[PDB]
Design a protein around this ligand. Structure first.
Ligand SMILES: CCCCCCCCCCCCCCCCCC(=O)OC[C@H](COP(=O)([O-])OCC(O)COP(=O)([O-])OC[C@@H](COC(=O)CCCCCCCCCCCCCCCCC)OC(=O)CCCCCCCCCCCCCCCCC)OC(=O)CCCCCCCCCCCCCCCCC
Ligand SMILES: CCCCCCCCCCCCCCCCCC(=O)OC[C@H](COP(=O)([O-])OCC[N+](C)(C)C)OC(=O)CCCCCCCCCCCCCCCCC
Ligand SMILES: NC(=O)C1=CN([C@@H]2O[C@H](COP(=O)(O)OP(=O)(O)OC[C@H]3O[C@@H](n4cnc5c(N)ncnc54)[C@H](OP(=O)(O)O)[C@@H]3O)[C@@H](O)[C@H]2O)C=CC1
Ligand SMILES: CCCCCCCCCCCCCC(=O)SCCNC(=O)CCNC(=O)[C@@H](O)C(C)(C)COP(=O)(O)O
Ligand code: SF4
Ligand code: SF4
Ligand code: SF4
Ligand code: SF4
Ligand SMILES: [K+]
Ligand SMILES: [Zn+2]
Lengths: 114, 207, 257, 145, 99, 126, 112, 96, 342, 45, 178
């Protein structure tokens, strides 16, 4: 209640900025895969971009959405340059680590973790 | 007393007079003016007056603080605005130092002072990288000290000392990969706080 | 020390100034010789690094380590000098200006070095102040500023030396400033060796400095303070300070809260 | 206190006692504060501890070879400010800056007294009492300690 | 130090400076590695009298910073001042101005 | 023109960079720490600490050290007020258990009760 | 008569009395647009008036620099025009107004 | 004195030997498990008891500052010798 | 379980998994991936080696502070085998060669050494013995190596009756001898295939899939004597596979029908070499032996491993063999090979 | 036992040169140009 | 005070002789020949190189080398399990698990020092109240594996027994300063 906006008055232009950022990432994925000799395909990278947007897609605060857009623009900028390397852009896929299972039987069989 | 420092009440009085001067010149922004017993002048202002306060201190005739020494942030995660942004300024003309404080939270950015001092470019990049305080109108605001894909702002109090991820070479993928952190030692925190107070001058009143 | 409101003893202060100028000679040797190595000449690097090895031997004699000598402490100075150290420092410093003269003759009048450094990286005084350089680029561009003269901290206020000042703001003027700062550091080293005072080595406050080991093993309060300083440490009263020291590379500041 | 000692003489020394398998007594470092005596007289109510002698020779303990073994007898280890009365099972194993403290409750007694488990490197090292004025006040029993 | 006269003359002429006076190899003028034992002095406050810690407790002389004005505590012709008197201009060095 | 109405709960967990495991499957405890019963000093109370639930610390096969797997093990956070700690926990999105401050009860103390004429408070040893 | 200023990028700037005169008069003329109760107006009028008085009093450059104590006269000129720029910026702003917002009660409390 | 486990490996002065079925002996396979031969408990057991005259004896480690903190031991019990806590030196009052 | 073998610790690389394992072919090509997976999950890995310490240097990482114990061994030293296996829950046998040397032949390599390792493991009382055979190493095969692997499979079954026996197909991956072999066919004029590469069906399997299958086998409650067939998800004709390989390489593709008799002659000519031979008669026979259909045997699917397709994990192998012109080409620039069923 | 400490000699240490010292040598310009021209003329003849 | 490094006082005007001198300096490369002479003199000097494994570099009794646990002259270990060296250890490189011994003395059961974690600062040896842990003069103890630098109590006691003939002499030469 009665906070100061940073870019967006409400959620609509925040979603507009989100759509602009998503367009930029979607266009940049093929150039990234071509330039950095990535094992993945263009479809996998665009699906990963959609996955990141979806895992951030539950927040309804305009300031938080604007800050996520700003951080996404920074990440996109260092992907536009080759500041990020193959290792940095393949860290999004978690190809090495085994995911912890979501079921109580497995989480009971190994570890005392909830 | 050969083990105690001298006091210099003359420069304490000078800094007090200059604090009155700045506080009455800029009443719109100045919230507090204090002079420590170490003879350092601190001026705590509203975040809206960062640009006018820093411009006044950069080029006012009686307050030429044209050199910016330091720009840092302090995370105090118990106040409502958890970041205290601190500017240490140097006056070569009058051979003085001033400190200007403002506040921020995770969702309230502060106007950058790159138009006033150019060192504020990298200093505000470091503040954003280490604390997540965004800066308005900053040219190429981005990370400066963390890794390229690093997530989170590590100088915050709630960030762990060891971080959340660690890097190792993996021969299957032939890469340097990131894993969740698993220490073989588990850094031992030490409770090095005496249960007896040491300084009665700072004894807070009870709640 | 400023947060604790204590002062180191005069012998500790003079030792700290002596090793401050020793660090300044080390750092300016490193800067000048590695700058010349990046330009293309390596013989001054080898000569002045033999000299740098002698000064690292001085560090290894005054403390344990050659480089990371955890020696200057908030309680003044950790340990006193061994008995031959001042004479060996004098023997090093009386021959040191010849080495600076050899490097000066090798580089300064050399037309290749002049073409490589003159009118390169010219910084105006106003731009240096606005960019907040504050260390050597100010006096290379002509700004008369040195913290050891303007805001003196240790016995720098009672040593005598000159601050070299550039006039063109380029690499050549900065190189000349660093060489002249080496010479003035030699001058301060001579003054410190002459005026070293006979006092104690750390502030006689057992609640900040650890006591001597004999007193610790023979006294109750000394053992209690040794235990608490080496387990918990001294409590610094709350407050924030910004302490700036004229380090050889520039204004080195600590904002302590 | 001050930071130095003006004492240039020889310190006294007191022979130790064998008060039990729980409380190790190094009575040389006792400061003659009678806290254990007051506790064992009022709270524990055994009246076995006391002062024998006069002056600098005044000593705390039992005059005879007495086995001070009651319930609520580690609380003298708690309330002794010096290390005159220490815990024999917790002999030399850890230090307070090492120990992580977890505030928990007690079992094997239906009082449910509040305790602090002092662990270190994933190993339970000590059980201390907590302060709850409505359950156990400041102390716990020997079984839970 | 162990060089012939002809080689010393060649070195001095080629360097342009006298080298045997300030050669950078240490031979015998350094201190002996085995030193006599020291007897370090005790500093002040070893006085055994008139030496109470409360009279030299510099750590507890620190006070909280003095508030000049406050937006809460205070709730608020004269000359303009400066943070300090302006710094006097440096004098040129007399032993070597090198100007 | 510069004020907007936001009716959220100030969620910054998407900005903190913490993995979702250490956000959701985590329990913080907000408490004034208990007085260490080995000492009579009370200065280590009166500040509200926030700590995390303790995870597994196992034994290193090589050296016998205590190995860990969670980063939020030594995460003592200090707050001047319970409401500030609650707000910080809610803002970072951690489930919290908060327990009230346990002040010692004010007690009647009289030196003359040790020498009572008829009450049981008369002591037998000074 | 002065050959160099000694600071890189600072021009020699002959006839500095006229330049200081016009800078100080422009500063006064733009200070006339501030409110009368503006402390910035009062103090800057004091500073500019006394510096203009000493620049009218002293005709020699070296003695004028010694009186001004602002470094070289070219540094004084640069400081005067920067003060004029600050006067314009402070007319665009309105710093003499009351405080925009009180801080929270524990915002400047140390230690916590 | 070092001893040998039935598995074969040596036993340290804090007896910590790996069991028969413990896998952590491949670290000693083709290498060695080094044990300090000089057991301090035996070395201080074979030290003689010092006969002193006073009821209270002061102990260092054998030097003014090269030893341990100077402690005092009370030799009132005739049945047992007083051992200094830092060293392992034992003192007995010469009551004759 | 002994107390030091309890699997306590989340995840891997610093935890204990209780998979103390002696890996015998660890210095080779499948062995590095197996050791990588074991050290990743966090396990005591005993590596007996006979090559140089420099040749085992690449294995010295991927283990956390003494979790990898290297010790020398000789294949003719029963004491060395016994001291390798005497502290191990699990023994994994990956010993193999693609050729025969003066000291060791196919019979020794695939029969005598696995029998000695299994015998020493049985006498030391290890709990599991995983042995890597080959798919279609059944009996009466055209090549000596497959017959030797069949006989060694029988010998390991006789000595260690509950040994897990894993039979992968032709394993592909980085530094393999299948994809790199077909990509190194470019150094000659044409590609000499038998019957133009037709009537020869292969389903290659990924190294990470095989190593994950081996690790899941050494942790699996089942597989106490079972035989697994580790195959890829798609079966390709040899002609289509080589055409896909040269398409991903972007070099060229001119095939050449060559009868197996003279192709075995050329293989023997290449195998006459004191160094590691480029190809040999047994190699070309195993190239032109078709894979069998895995019908009743379990595989990666019920060992918990999804078989990664070659069309997915093929660019990380064949990008070395491209020129600069075609180096920055994606997956979609090459059409996938036709998959047969048969 | 008197206080023994690392101290300078009672008369102080000797002088230490610190200023720049260049030899300031070489032939004059006229002599070098004259010997060069003489070598040129002799070689030409 | 201050001085100039490149500013010139007035000018030396223009003269035929000075012009000829500058012309000869430019044409005949006089400063280049001077630099040649300087490095020629350095050629004819004596090198400062020592024959390394036979002539070691000089050191001091204060030198911080390899860690060691010392003993009393009776043979009893000096360490009394007081843990304040690991309390002061700025790298947390020491682990000091301890228990009462068979004779009831306060001794250590685990004393580990991670030399790959230690910063070689001597804080442990200056904090130890009984001179138990020391940093002796051994610096040529480089190993071929990471594990050999993870010392335990047996390794530290072996180092103390190995280097006691030198550590005791260094402490004798040094203890009056500390
Ligand atoms: C040569 C290496 C093998 C011998 C090494 C040896 O035994 O050295 C001992 C010993 C040196 O040990 P030292 O006593 O430490 O040195 C004395 C001075 O410190 C050395 O200091 P210094 O430089 O003053 O003495 C050098 C001295 C002697 O130098 C020579 O004789 C070098 C050759 C000059 C022609 O030079 C002169 O006398 C003037 C030479 C002017 C040349 C223009 O004697 C020599 O080296 C004598 C000179 C040997 C010259 C051998 C030339 C032929 C080499 C093999 C060619 C095929
Ligand atoms: C016996 C071994 C002798 C080695 C000499 C090494 C150089 C040191 C000489 C001394 C010194 O520093 O002098 C500096 C001095 C200069 O010192 P300066 O720089 O201080 O002098 C400046 C003087 N004014 C301003 C007047 C110009 O050098 C000279 O005086 C002359 C140098 C130039 C002339 C010689 C070099 C050019 C010759 C070209 C023709 C070829 C000659 C034949 C070559 C045959 C072999 C290939
Ligand atoms: N790779 C493939 O395409 C396929 C392989 N297989 C089988 O899987 C197993 C592992 O495969 P792979 O990695 O490719 O094999 P490698 O070619 O990589 O060799 C495996 C290991 O065997 C060791 N070895 C070979 N001969 C001897 C010997 N005489 N004595 C001791 N050690 C020896 C090698 O050690 P060193 O380096 O010291 O010589 C090496 O570490 C083998 O049995 C192989 O036949 C099955 C199907 C397909
Ligand atoms: C090579 C691969 C590298 C991958 C790099 C990925 C970069 C990730 C950048 C992250 C930027 C963001 O995710 S900001 C987006 C979050 N925005 C929001 O949550 C705003 C509200 N969102 C919504 O309402 C969502 O439902 C939608 C679907 C985004 C909006 O659609 P509506 O129509 O229902
Ligand atoms: S409580 Fe401790 S210090 Fe007090 S009298 Fe008892 S034993 Fe002595
Ligand atoms: S820690 Fe306390 S009780 Fe123990 S010896 Fe020291 S002062 Fe005495
Ligand atoms: S030298 Fe320093 S870092 Fe190393 S063990 Fe000792 S205290 Fe720790
Ligand atoms: S080595 Fe010294 S400081 Fe460390 S625990 Fe032992 S006695 Fe204490
Ligand atoms: K106690
Ligand atoms: Zn003793």
């Amino acid at each position: 209640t009665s906070v100061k906006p940073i870019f967006s008055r409400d959620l609509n232009e925040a979603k507009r900025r989100v759509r602009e950022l998503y367009r930029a990432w979607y266009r940049e994925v093929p150039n990234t895969v071509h330039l950095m000799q990535l094992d993945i395909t263009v479809k996998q990278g665009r699906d990963k971009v959609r996955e990141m947007f979806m895992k951030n897609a539950h927040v309804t605060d305009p300031r938080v959405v604007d800050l996520l857009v700003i951080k996404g623009k920074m990440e996109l900028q260092e992907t536009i340059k080759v500041w990020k390397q193959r290792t940095h852009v393949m860290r999004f896929f978690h190809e090495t680590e085994t995911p912890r299972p979501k079921d109580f039987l497995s989480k009971f069989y190994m570890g005392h973790d909830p | 007393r050969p083990t105690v420092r001298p006091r210099s009440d003359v420069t304490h009085k000078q800094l007090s007079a200059f604090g009155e001067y700045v506080a009455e010149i800029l009443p719109k922004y100045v919230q507090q003016v204090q002079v420590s017993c170490l003879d350092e002048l601190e001026i705590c202002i509203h975040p809206d007056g960062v640009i006018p306060t820093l411009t006044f201190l950069r080029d006012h005739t009686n307050a030429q603080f044209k050199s910016l020494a330091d720009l840092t942030a302090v995370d105090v995660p118990t106040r409502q605005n958890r970041f205290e942004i601190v500017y240490n300024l140097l006056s070569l003309r009058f051979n003085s130092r001033i400190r200007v404080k403002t506040y921020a939270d995770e969702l309230t950015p502060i106007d950058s002072i790159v138009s006033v001092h150019i060192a504020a470019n990298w200093y505000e990049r470091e503040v954003w990288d280490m604390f997540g305080v965004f800066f308005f109108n900053h040219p190429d605001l981005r990370r400066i000290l963390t890794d390229y894909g690093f997530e989170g702002h590590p100088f915050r109090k709630d960030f762990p000392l060891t971080g959340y991820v660690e890097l190792r070479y993996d021969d299957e993928v032939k890469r340097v990969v990131a894993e969740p952190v698993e220490l073989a030692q588990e850094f031992r925190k030490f409770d090095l706080n005496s249960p007896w107070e040491a300084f009665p001058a700072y004894r807070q009143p009870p709640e | 020390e400023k947060l604790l409101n204590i002062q180191p003893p005069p012998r500790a202060q003079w030792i700290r100034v002596l090793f401050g100028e020793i660090t300044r000679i080390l750092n300016h040797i490193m800067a000048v010789t590695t700058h010349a190595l990046d330009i293309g000449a390596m013989t001054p690097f080898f000569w002045m690094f033999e000299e740098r090895e002698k000064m690292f031997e001085f560090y290894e004699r005054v403390s344990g380590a050659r480089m990371h000598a955890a020696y200057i402490r908030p309680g003044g100075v950790h340990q006193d000098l061994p008995l031959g150290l001042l004479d060996d420092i004098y023997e090093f410093s009386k021959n040191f200006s010849l080495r600076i003269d050899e490097v000066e003759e090798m580089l300064t009048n050399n037309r290749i070095w002049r073409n490589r450094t003159v009118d390169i990286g010219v910084v105006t005084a106003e731009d240096a102040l606005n960019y907040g350089f504050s260390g050597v680029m100010l006096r290379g561009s002509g700004i008369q500023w040195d913290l050891r003269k303007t805001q003196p901290y240790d016995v720098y206020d009672q040593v005598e030396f000159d601050v070299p000042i550039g006039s063109r703001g380029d690499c050549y003027d900065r190189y000349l400033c660093r060489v002249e700062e080496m010479r003035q550091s030699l001058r301060i080293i001579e003054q410190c060796l002459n005026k070293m005072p006979p006092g104690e080595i750390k502030v006689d406050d057992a609640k900040v400095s650890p006591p001597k080991r004999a007193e610790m093993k023979t006294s109750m309060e000394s053992l209690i303070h040794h235990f608490k300083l080496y387990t918990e440490g001294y409590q610094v009263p709350p407050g924030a300070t910004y302490t700036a020291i004229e380090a050889p590379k520039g204004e080195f500041g600590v904002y302590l809260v | 206190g001050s930071d130095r000692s003006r004492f240039l003489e020889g310190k006294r020394a007191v022979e130790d006692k064998n008060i039990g398998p729980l409380v190790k007594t190094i009575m040389t470092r006792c400061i003659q504060c009678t806290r254990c005596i007051r506790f064992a007289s009022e709270i524990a109510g055994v009246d076995d501890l006391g002062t024998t002698g006069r002056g600098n020779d005044m000593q705390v303990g039992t005059y005879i070879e007495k086995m001070f073994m009651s319930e609520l007898s580690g609380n003298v280890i708690d309330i002794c400010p010096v290390g005159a009365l220490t815990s024999k099972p917790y002999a030399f194993t850890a230090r307070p800056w090492e120990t992580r403290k977890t505030e928990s409750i007690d079992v094997m007694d239906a009082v449910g007294s509040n305790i602090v488990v002092s662990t270190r490197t994933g190993e339970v090292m000590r059980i201390l009492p907590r302060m709850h004025e409505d359950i156990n006040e400041e102390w716990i029993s020997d079984k839970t300690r | 130090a162990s060089a012939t006269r002809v080689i010393q003359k060649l070195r001095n002429w080629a360097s342009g400076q006298d080298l045997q006076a300030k050669l950078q190899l240490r031979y015998q003028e350094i201190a002996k590695r085995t030193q006599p034992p020291p007897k370090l002095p005790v500093g002040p406050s070893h006085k055994l009298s008139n030496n109470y810690y409360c009279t030299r407790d510099g750590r507890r002389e620190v006070v909280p910073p003095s508030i000049i004005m406050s937006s809460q505590k205070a709730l608020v012709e004269k000359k303009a001042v400066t943070p300090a008197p302006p710094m006097k201009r440096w004098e040129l060095s007399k032993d070597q101005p090198y100007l | 023109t510069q004020l907007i109405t936001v009716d959220e709960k100030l969620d910054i967990t998407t900005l903190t960079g913490v993995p979702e495991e250490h956000i959701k499957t985590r329990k913080v405890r907000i408490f004034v720490p208990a007085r260490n019963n080995m000492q009579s000093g009370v200065n280590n109370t009166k500040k509200w600490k926030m700590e995390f639930d303790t995870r597994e610390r196992w034994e290193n096969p090589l050296m016998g050290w205590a190995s860990t797997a969670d980063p939020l093990s030594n995460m003592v956070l200090t707050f001047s007020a319970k409401e500030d700690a609650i707000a910080f926990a809610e803002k970072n999105g951690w489930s919290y258990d908060v327990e009230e401050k346990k002040v010692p009860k004010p007690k009647s103390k009289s030196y003359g009760a040790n020498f009572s004429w008829n009450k049981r408070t008369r002591v037998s040893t000074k | 008569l002065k050959k160099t200023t000694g600071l890189v990028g600072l021009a020699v700037c002959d006839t500095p009395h006229e330049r200081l005169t016009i800078l100080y008069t422009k500063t006064l003329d733009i200070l006339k647009h501030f409110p009368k109760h503006a402390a910035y107006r009062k103090y800057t009028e004091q500073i500019t008036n006394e510096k203009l008085d000493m620049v009218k009093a002293e005709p020699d450059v070296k003695k004028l620099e010694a009186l001004l104590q602002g470094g070289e006269v070219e540094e004084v000129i640069l400081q005067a025009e920067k003060e004029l720029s600050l006067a314009r910026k402070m007319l665009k702003w309105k710093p003499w107004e009351p405080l925009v917002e009180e801080p929270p009660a524990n915002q400047w409390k140390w230690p916590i | 004195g070092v001893q040998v486990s039935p598995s074969g490996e040596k036993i340290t002065h804090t007896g910590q030997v790996y069991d028969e079925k413990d896998y952590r002996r491949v670290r000693f396979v083709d290498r060695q498990k080094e044990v300090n031969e000089n057991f301090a408990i035996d070395l201080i057991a074979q030290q003689p008891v010092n006969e002193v005259e006073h009821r209270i004896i002061a102990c260092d480690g054998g030097g003014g500052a090269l030893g341990h903190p100077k402690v005092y031991i009370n030799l009132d019990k005739e049945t047992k010798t007083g051992t200094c806590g830092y060293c392992g030196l034992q003192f007995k009052q010469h009551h004759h | 379980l002994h107390h030091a073998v309890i699997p306590h610790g989340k995840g891997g690389r610093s935890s204990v998994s209780g998979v103390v394992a002696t890996v015998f072919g660890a210095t080779g090509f499948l062995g590095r991936y197996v050791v990588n997976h074991l050290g990743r999950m966090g396990s005591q890995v005993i590596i007996p080696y006979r090559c140089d310490v420099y040749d085992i240097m690449h294995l010295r990482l991927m283990g956390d502070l003494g979790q990898l114990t290297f010790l020398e061994w000789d294949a003719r030293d029963k004491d060395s085998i016994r001291k390798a296996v005497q502290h191990s829950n699990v023994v994994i046998n990956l010993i193999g060669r693609e050729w025969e040397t003066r000291n060791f032949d196919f019979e020794d390599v695939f029969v005598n050494i696995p029998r000695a390792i299994a015998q020493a493991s049985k006498e030391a009382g290890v709990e599991r013995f995983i042995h890597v055979s080959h798919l279609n190493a059944s009996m009466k095969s055209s090549s000596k190596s497959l017959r030797s692997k069949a006989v060694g499979e029988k010998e390991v079954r006789s000595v260690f009756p509950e040994a897990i026996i894993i039979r992968p197909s032709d394993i592909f991956g980085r530094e393999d001898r299948f994809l790199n072999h077909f990509a190194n066919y470019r150094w000659f004029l044409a590609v000499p295939l038998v019957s133009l590469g037709f009537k020869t069906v292969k389903q290659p399997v990924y190294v990470a899939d095989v190593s994950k299958g081996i690790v899941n086998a050494t942790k699996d409650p089942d597989a106490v004597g079972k035989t697994f067939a580790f195959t890829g998800p798609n079966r390709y004709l040899l002609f289509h596979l080589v055409k896909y390989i040269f398409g991903m390489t972007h070099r060229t593709f001119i095939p050449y029908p060559l009868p197996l008799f003279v192709y075995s002659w050329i293989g023997k000519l290449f195998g006459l070499s004191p160094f590691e031979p480029w190809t040999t008669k047994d190699k070309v026979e195993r190239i032109h032996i078709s894979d069998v259909m895995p019908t009743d045997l379990p595989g990666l699917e019920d060992l918990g491993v999804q078989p990664t397709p070659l069309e997915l994990k093929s660019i990380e192998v064949l990008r070395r063999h491209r020129t600069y012109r075609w180096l920055s080409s994606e997956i979609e620039e090459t059409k996938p090979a036709k998959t047969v069923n048969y | 036992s008197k206080v023994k400490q690392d101290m300078p000699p009672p008369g102080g240490y000797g002088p230490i040169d610190y200023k720049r010292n260049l030899p300031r040598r070489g032939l004059s310009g006229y002599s070098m140009f004259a010997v060069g021209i003489g070598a040129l003329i002799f070689g030409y003849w | 005070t201050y001085k100039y490094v490149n500013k010139k006082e007035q000018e030396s005007e223009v003269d035929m002789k000075s012009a000829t001198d500058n012309a000869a300096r430019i044409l005949m490369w006089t400063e280049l020949i001077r630099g040649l002479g300087m490095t020629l003199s350095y050629l004819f000097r004596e090198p400062a190189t020592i024959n390394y494994p036979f002539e070691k570099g000089p050191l001091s009794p204060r030198f911080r080398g390899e860690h060691a646990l010392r003993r009393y002259p009776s043979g009893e270990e000096r360490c009394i399990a007081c843990k304040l060296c690991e309390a002061i250890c700025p790298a947390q490189a020491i682990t000091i698990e301890a228990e009462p011994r068979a004779d009831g003395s306060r001794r250590t059961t685990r004393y580990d020092i991670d030399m790959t974690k230690c910063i070689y600062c001597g804080f442990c040896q200056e904090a130890c109240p009984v001179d138990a842990i020391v940093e002796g003069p051994n610096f040529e103890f480089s190993t071929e594996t990471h594990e050999e630098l993870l010392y335990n109590k047996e390794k530290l006691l072996n180092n103390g027994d190995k280097w006691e003939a030198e550590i005791a002499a260094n402490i004798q030469a040094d203890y009056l300063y500390r």
